[PDB]
Each structure stands twice: as C-alpha cells, then as structure tokens.
C-alpha cells in the first residue's frame, strides 16, 4: 500500500449516477464500491451523495446491504442509523441510552460531476480537484455516458495505452490508423494546473471509418488518470470530445469510464458507442497481458515514447513529493512547466 | 392460422428505434424481427425505415445478415442490393445483364412513431392507424422508453392482464393495491375511432409506494393491443402516463413495450423502471401459466370482468367483419358506440 | 491457529450419520471432513465410528478415496489396511516382512450422538463432553435432523447471531419478531457445568406465523459453539426445542447443524424445516458480510449486547486458561458463576 | 523455490510440435508455455524452434499474442521484432533511430526431438541432454504421440507413480494386473549416463486385455523425469515401447506427455490410446490426492519401494551437488553406479 | 420421405474410420449413425464393416449400446447375437430352441473407402458407386482427413455453396477472392459416368494467403453430393486436391467431410486445416440462414448460376427417373452429356 498511498489524495470516479440509482429499488443506493482496495458504500441521503467505509461500527456488517431512510443510512443487522457525517444517531436496541462515542464510521469526500460519482479518500493536502471535462455545459454538444468497462490492468497502464499513438497501426489497423503510419511525431508537453496539455495533428486521408474520431487532437489530462481529448475531425469538420478516466479498484483491476460529446449529433449514439467498444476490444487483450501489472524499472523506452516517459516522470515526482508533505505535493502538482509556445 | 389473419390489418410495434440502431455497428440495421409468425427485416434506408421479408429472392439467404449500402439493403451471400420498394437494383455477378423481373422481395408499410418501429402486414383495407400515445409532444412530460420484455403469453391475454384490477390484491398486494380492496367498480365503456375509452377512480389512501401510479385512471385503448393509461396520481397530484403495447410474435409469444411519461420528473428514471419491472415480474408467471394460450369458450366470467368481456366481444366482431371484407371491417372498427355521458 | 488451539480440546460435530452413510455405496464411509483446518476421514469399522488423519503413512494418499472392508480402512493407492486404532495391519506388497512401526496414522476420539458424528482432536485434559441436547430420549418429542448448512462465517459469529435478541426486528421482521420490538431485556446469565444458561420471555401477540417457535426461551449453551433452546410456545402452549451447533471448519467457514424437536408432532416436518430454512436465508447474507471474519477489538458494544459480551469474555478466559494447562482449563470451563436466583 | 533451481539445468518438454502448429493459423506459433513457473514463448523462426521469455522489453506485453514475421517474432503492441537470439531488430516507431542496447529478451536452449519441443532454462553447467526414447528411428515400429494430459501433481510424484507396480492390484485391477499379485520383486538398479536402468518380468497368465502392454519390462529412465519402458509382451510376442515424461509447469502442476511405439501395428491406434487413457484416469484421482504435493520426510517406505527410494536418493544427490557447482553436478549425474551383472 | 426416396440409392459417408474406432474402447464399434433419418449402427465384425438398423428384433433396444464379440454384434438387453447378415444366431435364454425366423434385423451395404465409412440404403438399382477421390493412391500427395463438421443446412445447399464462385467476394473477401472480382465466367459442364465435370481458371494475382488453394480448378463431382476439386495453384505451381462430401443426416442437417491432399507437403497440416476451417466458418452462418431448407420453385436465378441451375436440373431428372424404375434411373445417371471439347 506504500507506493500507492499518494493516489488517495486525488478524486477518483467509482460509479455512474445511473449505477447508483439502479443498485437499489429506492434509487438512493446503497451501492458497494471499491477504490484503492478500500471497501466503501455510496448512498444519496437527502440532497447529498455520501461515501462511508462499508463496515458498521457495531458488529462489522456491510452497510451496503442496508437501506436509506431519509437522512440516514441504516445497517441491515441491528438497524443502527448513520448520518451524513458517518455518526450513529440511533441505536434501536437502546433508544434511551447515550450512543457510544466510538459509534462512528469513516466518512469520505463524495461528489457528483458529469454524471459520475467521485470519491477522494484523503483530503489532507487540500489541493486536488475533480478532473476537467471540456464538453460539460457546452450547449453545442450532445453528451453520452457509456457503461463502465472493467479491465485486468492498472490505471497507469490504461492511461499510457490511451495516449500512445505508436500502437494504432498494430492494434487498431482497421479502425483508427493506417497500418503504414507507425512513426508518430514528438510533441511539446506542458504542465499547467495539474494537467498535462499537448496537441497532435494525426495523419490525413487514412482508410478509417467516418465515425472514427480522427483529426487535430488536443489533450488536457488531469493527473493522474483522466484524459480529455478534443478532436477537430478531418472527415466532418466538427468537434468530438472523449473523456476517459480509470478507477484504480485494486492493484490489478480498473473500472473505466468513457464519456463522449459531439457537435454533429443528428446521427445515432450507437454508431459511436459501437465504435468505441470495438477500439476497446482491440486494446483489451494486449493491455491485460502486460506483466508485471506495474511497470518495472527495466522497461526499455524509445524516443517515440515521450508522452509515457513524461507521465512516469511526473508520477514519480508526485510520489516523492507526497513523502515530503502537503506543500511539496502542491508544488509538484500545480507548478507550471511549459514546453510549447502557448499562453495559459 | 385463419383465426389470426384479421390481425395482419393492424399496425404492430416490432422493435424500439434503440434496438434497430444497436443491431449492427453501422446503426442503420438490418435487424431481424418476427410478427404474426412472419420473418421480416427492418433497416434505415436513407431517410426511411423499411420492412422487407427476411429472405433474398436469389437463394433465400436472410437479408438480416446483410448490410445497408447507401439507400439499399445488400444480401450477405451474393451481394444483391434491394431498394426501399424491395426491388433488386444490382446483381454484382452479372453487372451488364438485365436483372430478372422476379428479383424482388415483399415490402410492408413501416413507420417510426414514439421511438418504436411499427409494421402493417396487410394494407389492403387501408383503415387502420398507429395507436394513440397521449404524452407525445407534451413538453410538460419526460418520456422513458423501456427495453422490451418477452412473455410466453398471447397479446390478448396480455391486454386483459393490463386492464384488469380484480387481480391487484392477489398479484400486486405490496405494489399496486391493498389486499382487502378486491371489489372493483363496473364502468361505462365507449368505442370511438377504433379505441376503447373508459375512466376509473382507484381506491385512495392505499399503503403502496409513492412511485406507484395510483389515482384517477383514464384509458384510451387503440384496438387491438395498445393501452394508453393517463393517471392523475393521488399521492403527488401529477400526471403519469403508461403506454403498453404487445407485438404478437407468434401463436404463443409476445414482445411487449412500455413507454411511460411523467409530469414530476426531477426524480430518478430508475425509481420508475424498477417499479414497472417489479409489477411485470409479479404478473409474468401467472399469465404465462394460463392454458390453453388462447382463451376458450369454457372460461367463466363474473360481472367484474366487464372490460375483458367487452374486449373479447369487439375482437370477435372484428374477426367476423374481416371475413365480410373491407367495408364491413371499417364499420366494425370505426363506428362509435357510446355508453357514458361524455361528448362525442 | 495458535489462537485456535484451545478449541481442539472440545467435541465438534463433523457430519450427520446420514451423510456418512450416503458418502459411499457401502454405507460405511469413508467420508472426508475438515475440522479446525485439519483434514480427517470418518468411517464405520464394524460397530465403531473412527476418525483418522486423511493421509496414508506410506505415500500420503487420501484414505477418504479408499474403501472400508469390515474392520479395516484400505488406502486406494497400495492397499495398506488400517484398523480402528489407526495402525496398519497389512502391507500387501510385503506380506511376510514386518510392518514398520511408523506405519500408523493419528486416530482421534469419534462418537455418534443425537444422529451426528462428533470428533475431539485432543483428549488430554479429559474434561469436555459432547454438548447437551435436552430433547434426546424424551419420548414426548418427535426429533428431526436437518441437512447441514454451510456459511462463509466463523463459528463465533454464528453463535452470536443465534443468541442475539436485537436483530430479530431488522433481519426477521416477517418471521420471528414484529419490527416494533427492537428493545430486548438484559437477562441474568449463569455459567454451570461448562454451559451458559439464561432465560428470555419474548414479546407476546406478535404478527408471526404459528410454526414460529416464539414463547418463553430457555437457553442451555454448551461452550463453545452449541445452543440448546427450549421454547414454551405462546401460540400452541407446547414444547419446541432447537439444537444448533457450528463445526469450525477453518478460519472463515462453518458447517452448521440444526436438530429440532416438537411435542405437537401431527403436522409436517417440512412445515418446520421450511421455516428454519427461511430464517437461515434471512441471516446468511448479513452474517457472511461481516468483516474481518474474526471480531476485532474495535467493535462497539452497547448494553443490549450482554450475551455476546459475556460470550466473548468466557472464550477469552478459556483461551488464556488453556495456556496454563489442564487444571486451569478445567476450572475456567466447569466452575459455576451464578447470576440468577435459580438453583442447579 | 531454491529447492527447484537444480531442475533448470535439465531439458524439459513443454509442448508437442502439433500444439505449436495448432496455436496460430500461420502454423509457426507463437505458443505460450510455462516451465518451472517461467512464462515462455515458443515459435518457429526460419528453420529453428526458438524459446524466449514471454515479455516484450518495451512495455512488457506478451509476445505470445504476437506474430511470426519472416524469421522474427513481432510483439502485438508496438510491433518490435525479435530475432532468434532475442535481440530487437526493428522498432517501427523510430525506424531511423538506433535501437536501444537493452532492447532484447532472454532466449533459452530449445530443440525439437521425437515430436516434442524441449527447453533447457540454464545451460551454464552444459552437461545435460534430451532424454532417450529407444523407438526413435526404428522402422519396425509405428509411433503415436498422444495429446498431453494435465495433472494436479508434481513431476516427482508422477515419475514414482509410473515406475511403481505395488499399486497395480489396487488402482488397475481390471487393466494392468491381477488384484491378487500385489507382491513385486526387488530388482537391481544401475545408474549409467544419467539414466536409471532396471529390468523386470511381470507376472504371466494374468486376466488383462490383449492390448495391455504386459510382459518383460526394461526401463531406461533419463533423470529426472523421463521414462523409456520397453515391453516384450507375453500375449503377442511383440515389442511395445512407452515413453512418458512430465513437464514441471509449476510447484503443483504437471503437463505430461506419452509417446508409444509398437511392432505389431495393423490394429487401431485408438485401441491403445483408449487403454492408456483409461490407465491414466485410474491413476489420476489418487495421485492428485497425495498431500503435501512434495513428499516430506515422514513418509514410510517398505522394501518393495526400492525404485522410489533410489530415485529420491539420486534426486537428493543432484540437488546437493548443484550447490557445489558444475563439476560436482556433472559427476553426480554421469558417474556410473552398477548393481546388476550387465556389461557397462 | 417421398421426394427424398431417390437419395437412398446412392452411397453416403456416415463417419470417419477414426470415429468408428474411437466410439468404443474395443476399437470395433458399435457406433450409432443417422442417414436420411434412418437410425443405423456400424461395427467391424472380423474383417467386415457392417451396418444394420439400430433396433433389436426382440424388444427393440438399440444395438449401438451393445458389444462386438468376434463375428457377432451382441444386443445389450438380453444378449441376442447378430451375424454380418443381420440374422440372430444366438438367443442366450433359449440356447436349444430354434431361433424364430423373424429374429433378423435389416442389413445394409457398408464399405470403407478413403478413410470414411459409406452406407448405401437401397442397392436395388445396382448402378451407383462410392464417389471418386482423385488423390487416392497417388504417392506424390500427402492426404489429411479432417474431423467432420455439422451444419444446419441440407446437402443440396451445401453442394451449391461449395461450387459457387459468385459468393467469394462477399463471404470470403479476405481469404479466397478479391472483393472486386464478383463476375464469374460461364463454363461448359459435362455429365460423364454419373459425374459433373467442369474446369475453371480463377483470377490471378489476388490478395489471398499463400495456403489458399487458388489456381486452375478442375471439378469432378460424383452425383449427388461429393465434389473432387483439383487445384493447380498459381502461387506454388503444385497440386492441391479438396474432396468434400455431405452426409444427408435428416431433412435439415448435414454431417460434412473434407479430405485434402497436397503435392508440396513439407509444411504443416495445420496451416491448411486452419485455413479450411476459416473458410467454412465464413460460409456457415449464411448457408444455415437459407430458408426454407429445401430450395423452393420460387428462387430467382441469373446467368452466373449456371452450375447450380444444371445441378438442380440433373437432380430433378434423377428424381423423375427413380419413379420410372431401375433402367430409367441408370440412364439418367450414367448417360453422357458433353458440352466441352474434351474426350473421356
Ligand atoms: C484512445 N482512443 C480511443 O480509445 C478512442 N475511441 C474512439 N476514438 C478513440 N480515439 C481517437 C482514441 O485516441
Ligand atoms: C397495469 N399496470 C401496470 O402494469 C403498471 N406498471 C406500473 N404501474 C402500473 N399500473 C398502474 C398499471 O395499472
Ligand atoms: C435463532 N433462531 C432460529 O434460528 C430459529 N429458527 C426457527 N426458530 C428460531 N428461533 C426461535 C431462533 O431464535
Ligand atoms: C505405468 N504404465 C502405464 O502408464 C501404462 N499405460 C499403458 N500401459 C502402461 N504400462 C504398462 C505401465 O506400466
Ligand atoms: C469451396 N472451397 C472451399 O471450401 C475451400 N476451402 C479451402 N479452399 C477452398 N476452396 C478453394 C474452395 O473452393
Ligand atoms: S452490525 Fe450494524 S447495527 Fe449491528
Ligand atoms: S442469396 Fe442473396 S444474393 Fe444470393
Ligand atoms: S499411499 Fe497408501 S498404501 Fe501407498
Ligand atoms: S510492448 Fe512490445 S512493442 Fe511495445
Ligand atoms: S432387446 Fe435385444 S436381446 Fe432383447
Ligand atoms: Co488503443
Ligand atoms: Co398485473
Ligand atoms: Co437471525
Ligand atoms: Co498406475
Ligand atoms: Co464459401
């Protein structure tokens, strides 16, 4: 848990709002989720999304097997009722007696945004924010939230797969790139407000389907695991946005979320969903094969790996700064480092 | 067989638009569907939804395994291309030769309405229309189209299940009615424009969930299988509309569609979907147990069965009038028969 | 397993007699069983039930894959024949050679009582007895031995679930308690002859099925894992006895046994079996959810938890006394500690 | 772990040539295989069978999901191509740049012999050879390579099962021996050229099928896991050879190979395959039951266990000599030790 | 059964010799097979392959559940023994009494050829022969018998699929033909000795794999269901032969056999097997979709359908001639009808 501890300071998606509403017939939850190997429960208490450890203080039953009752989450075993702060406010067996001081469960940051539920396990450094999705509140764009997809691969390896262009000719030859353009350009990369920003111009006139988001690629990557990709498409001259983020469920699993938005929206959502699913099915077996799950020091990079080289370097900086404490981590995350000629 | 020929003259839903778009990665279809034991294929050819028999004129392959190409449907076997009228316009093996006169497949009236695809197999009487859904184009109402649900029961038995309230205390005691209000009123029923119209007032103060659409019930039933139920709810003083229609797939199977609309729409869609699904799960085993599948003459009615009795009577009249021809059928369907004091 | 070693000194049930007879077509076993993570084999050799380690001394094959031949258990691999004392008496490959003195397997106390097979792994303290079942040899009572039921929960958590008053309202609302009677009395508890003894008069006039054993509850709990509950039922004024005992199979699993006896026995055994199975089905998901599997020090008790508080206290004293040896253990188990006004 | 390092110095079979050719539609591989817990990939690169670690040096994808291209193995992820020495010779993303010095993967000695693929993980002692199969290149004999069979048992326990006849009466009574000849002779055993050699004469006139290879048995066992058994059958006066060898896949699993050759070969191959499969099915549950998987020091031998005893002794000597280095190991393996009157 | 009766006069394959030898551990059978909806049993009695109705004369048990005992097939129920002529020669219950005259089962023509077992149900016209396989006894060629493949399609539709070239561009675009050459040539077709003979020159320089049998195509089709295709390949300048034959199992199923032979045989059998299997997997869903299973009179042909038009015409002639009797059928089958300029 040691090398991963710094990840607890970020906001991570754990489920869609849809999944929470479908979990229990009340539409309020509770829903069991797992984040960085922590077993948590999510529920809607009044107007608030809450996240607690999925473990009752009394006899350790799972609260995720319980029931929302107005402004309370009720344990299924002996009916202890927890408020939005994780504090027990009713012990039905002793309704007069004072409630023990220890009758509380851990309560974590939990917020809805973009149709996903986000949890931050450690808020002590008070310097991380929910990742940036550029299409939110853009009335020009129709937004579709896909169903989550689970991979037997880590969030770091998934991020590197999503931002890697040298693999398109070998993994996506029918679908995203010609098999003949295996040589990608080396682009400037900027750190700004805790995001990696970089821009690409993919090759034109490739034998790829019209629904393929191929064009001018503008990445805004909220560290550590979210990618916002704005595509000015060549084929249609219209904006298409991909927002992909991985939930690090445990040491070898990710629950992954894709939200996409498009300016030309008279067509079928399922044209795009089927295409995204095909791309993911092409990536999945190769990424799941990578072993060990966490990239060892012995991996051999080439110059075309600039994006993942720079990604790994920043992650190591954040892990090092975490050991040094709050101010060092804030600096490592939010200090600007500009390579390009743009102004922010 | 013979008993069911008259049903070919009505419009029946065969799939949702969502089902069509999901069937094939192109989002255009084709999709195989079955209606009154006919194997059909639906596809979006240009701006039109087209229904054809699912059987190529060349060597009888299923066109539903083929592909939409431009505004035509291409057979998977030797690539014959069919236009919106079912006529073959390209024989790839014989590009110069004249296309055989009989190179064509049967085409059927096919329209989208309310997010469903409707097919009329026999248009020769030309007096039937797509059923009425009251909530379409009412901006006060949020509309949800559920996924279809399949039952091993006929469309007639499904219709009678949907409009019966005698069964609420026994099939839906927790969910729609109190167990001790089993006695229902007997209301006037009007025939108008091929619809059964009748109005109820279900019992008040019943211990049923708040998401239960219980209140004053106004039915508009487009013969033979569609029900439009407008509820002015007691618990929320808000309009809730249920539109239920059965596809008669064959002699013992229905593919059933529910669309629901609601005025108070700040809550979760899945609160309502979960409730509807629970109601359907309560009905399903009992309706599927009814045998023989078609109601025989030996069933014993009581006065509380008025809706069922009058429905069976009208269906019998429609079946007999169909044998007398187009004009007799038009009168049996569209002549008014008013029982209530309502103006028309 | 250092902290479970004291449990080896008690008698634990490992199967029903029916299970042993059904295991092999001979009706004599062998049957593989597991107790405290020890792999054992049970068989009927002549008139005796025998238990040995399930591991042949020769080449370590499982004797449970072998065959009973009258008064011998024969290994499946090279046919070594073990007698009722675990000693090899025939090496078929060397019929004239003397049998090595090492050719023996560990043999454990094994006795039938009440239709179960009991094993005691360590008889050195010579102060433990098979648990008490009050209905044995009471000719007024019809006895039913249920099939065993397996839970992913420990024997301690199962015992505490069975004797807990406060969960009935939340886990068993339809079946054992009204949801309104959540506040239990705090009763005197006596230690006598290695049993916990306590009485509880459950609430009257509860909307609960008539086959529910609800009434005046008299518990005789043979430590560590057996519960004998005599119910003088309110609804029928007749005696109903529940005898529940958990086999600690390993650190996270129990094989549980229920025997029940009843004075009014003209009804169906399966009326009561189905009721017991419904109660167990209501408990099972919540008990299996408790984590960690062993109750840790951080659990928060309230005054209504008296029974489980006192149970945990006695188990801890037995564990500590086992470290101090035979006499200290005998005193911790068998010394009386009287809280009530009763005489024994 | 440490206990098994000496086994890396021997040649072990990992697949049949048939398995390699079936793995990929090209018939060239690649095929993933596992040997002593190492994940390897085998492919036919030009005229050579090559074994590499199944892990690309770039980003650790499995080369076994890749493709043979010319005389190289191409990774599925970014198309790096590895030559027969494990060196990367093409980085498609950086065609002009120099290939990193560390762009290479470990390669292992790999040869085809007898229709199997053999791998030696550690070649530094350079004193081991591929096991001896007597029937290779004997045109009097028809050879059949069976499909591999997997057992949840170690290669040591499998070897001892194959060379034991004490068990025939109990495991194979219908098939290999009479049940009442359980007493076997004790024969001289010779060590010569890294092989155990010993000769038997099984009992005559036994009620076993004609396809049973029962007769005069001559064993040549190439240490540690290969057995060559030449049978001069009693029933047919014809030579029958069984070659059995176990791949030690990991600490508890074997992938086992049987090749059999016969002089009288006008009958069906499947008469013999069915018989061998029946024998293996009789052994399998008993051998898989042996626990712990590795034989501990507490097993009790009898004089009939001579073959097993001498096998364990030699393995112990090889393990100890390996710790002393290459010369000590060569002597322990290849020094002769003659017990019989046979000339060498 | 009426329109299919003429097919009983031909020899049909029912299993491979391998399948017969694998069916029972004796390697002699019996094996149940089904041909033209007849339930038959195949067994090897001495040197003879025999086929009988799979139904004992005594109490109608299946002989396929029985045992070969030298020159007899023994029923499993009461052990009646049938000789190679289907006559019972032993009634174990009455070993002295005369055997009833009716104690016989129907016996059918049954012969091995090319590694397949062939059955002819009706030999009364004495004019049909086992189909021609050109590669048999050609020492230049290596022969591989594939495992049978089952399709939900009739033998007529399978034959037409195999000899159809207009479908390659749509069903086999990667594998057998360019998608751009959809236009096939019209070739002369000869009837000779009950075979259709015709020759094709497929297009050259197509983007197809090297193991694809593409070249000069010489067909010899033994009516009604066997195709012998000799390919003088363009890519390798070497002979490749495909022998495909369908067993008409019942009215909607075929059990299909592929044997292939090749002159250049230093490569892997599985290169070719995998390619054939890919081709079959491409055909299978489209052919299984064709409905009704038997081609109706309403199918619309084009000039490129010459082969199947001529096939259907000959089949109709054979069906008509069958009604007229033995001499008419012999003439329809064996009279020559020459279109080309070759001499036979
Ligand atoms: C990584 N990735 C994707 O996963 C994807 N899915 C659909 N377009 C996509 N694009 C353009 C992309 O770059
Ligand atoms: C038949 N029926 C239903 O199936 C249903 N489902 C949800 N409300 C429902 N109501 C009010 C109803 O009358
Ligand atoms: C724990 N428990 C049970 O498990 C049970 N099962 C049936 N009656 C029961 N009673 C009264 C009970 O207390
Ligand atoms: C161990 N073993 C076998 O596994 C076997 N299988 C077939 N004959 C066999 N024989 C003679 C044999 O000794
Ligand atoms: C029909 N057919 C096949 O099924 C086939 N399979 C492999 N080559 C093939 N060829 C050349 C072919 O014509
Ligand atoms: S375990 Fe939650 S209330 Fe007791
Ligand atoms: S079957 Fe449709 S094109 Fe031939
Ligand atoms: S392992 Fe039991 S007799 Fe050998
Ligand atoms: S992981 Fe193999 S080429 Fe990149
Ligand atoms: S049924 Fe065959 S012998 Fe009696
Ligand atoms: Co990718
Ligand atoms: Co209902
Ligand atoms: Co309970
Ligand atoms: Co054996
Ligand atoms: Co084909």
Swiss-Prot record, chains A, B, C, D, E:
Positions contributing to [2Fe-2S] cluster binding: 56, 58, 75, 78
Pathway linked to the protein: Alkaloid degradation
UniProt signal peptide: none
pH dependence: Optimum pH is 7.5.
Its EC number(s): 1.14.13.178
Cofactor(s) needed by this chain: [2Fe-2S] cluster
Catalyzed reaction equations: caffeine + NADH + O2 + H(+) = theobromine + formaldehyde + NAD(+) + H2O; caffeine + NADPH + O2 + H(+) = theobromine + formaldehyde + NADP(+) + H2O; theophylline + NADH + O2 + H(+) = 3-methylxanthine + formaldehyde + NAD(+) + H2O; theophylline + NADPH + O2 + H(+) = 3-methylxanthine + formaldehyde + NADP(+) + H2O
Claim: Iron is one of the keywords in the record: yes
Biological processes annotated in GO: alkaloid catabolic process
Temperature dependence, free-text field: Optimum temperature is 30 degrees Celsius.
All residue ranges annotated as the Rieske domain in the record: 11-119
InterPro entries reported in the protein's UniProt record: Cholesterol_7-desaturase (IPR050584), Rieske_2Fe-2S (IPR017941), Rieske_2Fe-2S_sf (IPR036922), VanA_C_cat (IPR044043)
Origin: domain of life: Bacteria
Keywords, comma-separated and alphabetical: 2Fe-2S, Alkaloid metabolism, Iron, Iron-sulfur, Metal-binding, NAD, Oxidoreductase
SUPFAM superfamilies, sorted: Bet v1-like, ISP domain
GO molecular function, one term: demethylase activity
Cofactor binding remark: Binds 1 [2Fe-2S] cluster per subunit.
Database matches in PANTHER family: 3-KETOSTEROID-9-ALPHA-MONOOXYGENASE, OXYGENASE COMPONENT, IRON-SULFUR DOMAIN CONTAINING PROTEIN
Function: Involved in the caffeine degradation, which is the essential first step for assimilating the carbon and nitrogen in caffeine. Catalyzes the N1-demethylation of caffeine to produce theobromine and formaldehyde. Also catalyzes the N1-demethylation of theophylline, paraxanthine, and 1-methylxanthine to 3-methylxanthine, 7-methylxanthine, and xanthine, respectively. NADH is the preferred substrate.
Descriptive protein name: Methylxanthine N1-demethylase NdmA
Organism lineage: Bacteria, Pseudomonadati, Pseudomonadota, Gammaproteobacteria, Pseudomonadales
Gene: ndmA
